[PDB]
Design an enzyme around this catalytic site. Structure first.
Site, PDB file in Angstrom:
ATOM      1  N   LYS A   1     -23.430 -17.883 -35.916  1.00  0.00           N
ATOM      2  CA  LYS A   1     -22.344 -16.903 -35.672  1.00  0.00           C
ATOM      3  C   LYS A   1     -21.740 -17.006 -34.266  1.00  0.00           C
ATOM      4  O   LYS A   1     -20.525 -17.117 -34.114  1.00  0.00           O
ATOM      5  CB  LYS A   1     -22.891 -15.476 -35.895  1.00  0.00           C
ATOM      6  CG  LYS A   1     -23.209 -15.167 -37.366  1.00  0.00           C
ATOM      7  CD  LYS A   1     -24.044 -13.892 -37.592  1.00  0.00           C
ATOM      8  CE  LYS A   1     -23.359 -12.583 -37.170  1.00  0.00           C
ATOM      9  NZ  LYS A   1     -23.458 -12.302 -35.715  1.00  0.00           N
ATOM     10  N   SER A   2     -22.608 -17.029 -33.256  1.00  0.00           N
ATOM     11  CA  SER A   2     -22.241 -17.121 -31.832  1.00  0.00           C
ATOM     12  C   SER A   2     -21.503 -18.427 -31.498  1.00  0.00           C
ATOM     13  O   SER A   2     -20.572 -18.430 -30.693  1.00  0.00           O
ATOM     14  CB  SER A   2     -23.496 -17.005 -30.956  1.00  0.00           C
ATOM     15  OG  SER A   2     -24.236 -15.837 -31.279  1.00  0.00           O
ATOM     16  N   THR A   3     -21.876 -19.538 -32.147  1.00  0.00           N
ATOM     17  CA  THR A   3     -21.245 -20.854 -31.939  1.00  0.00           C
ATOM     18  C   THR A   3     -19.913 -20.977 -32.687  1.00  0.00           C
ATOM     19  O   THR A   3     -18.956 -21.517 -32.132  1.00  0.00           O
ATOM     20  CB  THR A   3     -22.206 -21.995 -32.308  1.00  0.00           C
ATOM     21  OG1 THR A   3     -23.388 -21.895 -31.537  1.00  0.00           O
ATOM     22  CG2 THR A   3     -21.627 -23.374 -31.995  1.00  0.00           C
TER      23      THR A   3
ATOM     24  N   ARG B   1     -37.898 -23.777 -31.199  1.00  0.00           N
ATOM     25  CA  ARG B   1     -37.607 -23.291 -29.831  1.00  0.00           C
ATOM     26  C   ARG B   1     -38.840 -22.653 -29.171  1.00  0.00           C
ATOM     27  O   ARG B   1     -39.657 -22.017 -29.835  1.00  0.00           O
ATOM     28  CB  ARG B   1     -36.424 -22.297 -29.855  1.00  0.00           C
ATOM     29  CG  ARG B   1     -35.098 -22.820 -30.442  1.00  0.00           C
ATOM     30  CD  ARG B   1     -34.406 -23.928 -29.633  1.00  0.00           C
ATOM     31  NE  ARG B   1     -35.077 -25.234 -29.782  1.00  0.00           N
ATOM     32  CZ  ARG B   1     -34.639 -26.429 -29.441  1.00  0.00           C
ATOM     33  NH1 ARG B   1     -33.468 -26.624 -28.902  1.00  0.00           N
ATOM     34  NH2 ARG B   1     -35.402 -27.462 -29.646  1.00  0.00           N
TER      35      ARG B   1
ATOM     36  N   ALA C   1     -27.816 -17.591 -37.277  1.00  0.00           N
ATOM     37  CA  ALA C   1     -27.029 -18.170 -38.379  1.00  0.00           C
ATOM     38  C   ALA C   1     -25.747 -18.933 -37.957  1.00  0.00           C
ATOM     39  O   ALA C   1     -24.807 -19.070 -38.740  1.00  0.00           O
ATOM     40  CB  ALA C   1     -26.791 -17.081 -39.438  1.00  0.00           C
TER      41      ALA C   1
ATOM     42  N   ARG D   1     -21.655  -3.416 -11.796  1.00  0.00           N
ATOM     43  CA  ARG D   1     -22.343  -4.435 -10.978  1.00  0.00           C
ATOM     44  C   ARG D   1     -21.324  -5.298 -10.202  1.00  0.00           C
ATOM     45  O   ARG D   1     -20.126  -5.230 -10.501  1.00  0.00           O
ATOM     46  CB  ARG D   1     -23.221  -5.285 -11.921  1.00  0.00           C
ATOM     47  CG  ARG D   1     -24.362  -4.459 -12.547  1.00  0.00           C
ATOM     48  CD  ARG D   1     -24.973  -5.135 -13.779  1.00  0.00           C
ATOM     49  NE  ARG D   1     -24.056  -5.082 -14.936  1.00  0.00           N
ATOM     50  CZ  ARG D   1     -24.362  -5.299 -16.202  1.00  0.00           C
ATOM     51  NH1 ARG D   1     -25.577  -5.574 -16.590  1.00  0.00           N
ATOM     52  NH2 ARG D   1     -23.440  -5.245 -17.113  1.00  0.00           N
TER      53      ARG D   1
ATOM     54  N   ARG E   1     -38.689 -10.932 -37.204  1.00  0.00           N
ATOM     55  CA  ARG E   1     -37.358 -11.570 -37.261  1.00  0.00           C
ATOM     56  C   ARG E   1     -37.044 -12.145 -38.646  1.00  0.00           C
ATOM     57  O   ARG E   1     -35.937 -11.950 -39.146  1.00  0.00           O
ATOM     58  CB  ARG E   1     -37.236 -12.604 -36.125  1.00  0.00           C
ATOM     59  CG  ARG E   1     -35.774 -12.996 -35.853  1.00  0.00           C
ATOM     60  CD  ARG E   1     -35.644 -13.717 -34.503  1.00  0.00           C
ATOM     61  NE  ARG E   1     -34.233 -13.979 -34.165  1.00  0.00           N
ATOM     62  CZ  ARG E   1     -33.775 -14.563 -33.073  1.00  0.00           C
ATOM     63  NH1 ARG E   1     -34.553 -15.034 -32.142  1.00  0.00           N
ATOM     64  NH2 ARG E   1     -32.490 -14.681 -32.909  1.00  0.00           N
TER      65      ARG E   1
END
Length: 198
Positions: free
Chosen positions: A18-20, A138, A16, A45, A149
């Site tokens: 959100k990440s961008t 994609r 949606a 790590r 999903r």
């Protein structure tokens, strides 16, 4: 309103934008927003450090933190234990930043069930079919995963209408329009974090 900035919770259906929006937000307001560092039983790590990436604790100390208050967001996978201690939220606030969380609809229901009260923000796709078109465009997806999903996004779209779930309910009608509504919705907490304005 002149006061200290509160933490923030982001949510809504899968993807949606959100990440961008979040990557635009943290790049524009450079180091003013910061993430809560999750506690874990893992070993670091190469290039990881305690309090930088994750809070690295023993299995005894992790369960001692569950008994203290981490249990609201505790998880276990492949013999390792993970969680959000209330220390991890207060850590970013002690550096005088805005503390950021981004979680599923059940995560939002968990935060409001404890003594936390951040600002609640949800972002949704412009229609459920547009999320379907974006996923099918994609190469990473497959038809079996698409069905799960879209069925998850259907339930998340319905929870995003509930008046007790969110203070702020944004639509991804355009990435720029959703970023403008997000930045305006956060404008008071940004003014408080910059220590400026009324």
């Amino acid at each position: 309103h002149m006061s200290g900035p509160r933490p923030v919770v982001l949510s809504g259906p899968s993807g949606a934008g959100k990440s961008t929006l979040l990557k635009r937000l943290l790049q524009e307001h450079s180091g003013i927003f910061g993430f809560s560092v999750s506690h874990t039983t893992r070993n670091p790590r190469p290039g990881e450090e305690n309090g930088k990436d994750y809070y690295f604790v023993t299995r005894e100390v992790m369960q001692r933190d569950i008994a203290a208050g981490d249990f609201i967001e505790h998880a276990e996978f492949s013999g390792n234990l993970y969680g959000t201690s209330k220390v991890a939220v207060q850590a970013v606030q002690a550096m005088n930043r805005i503390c950021v969380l981004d979680v599923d609809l059940q995560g939002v229901r968990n935060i409001k069930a404890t003594d936390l009260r951040p600002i609640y923000i949800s972002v949704q796709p412009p229609s459920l079919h547009v999320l379907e078109q974006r996923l099918r465009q994609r190469n990473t997806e497959t038809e079996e995963s698409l069905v799960k999903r879209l069925a998850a996004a259907q339930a998340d779209m319905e929870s995003s209408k509930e008046p007790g779930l969110f203070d702020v309910v944004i639509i991804n009608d355009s990435l720029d329009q959703a970023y403008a509504e997000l930045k305006e919705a956060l404008s008071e907490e940004i003014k408080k974090a910059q220590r400026t304005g009324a």
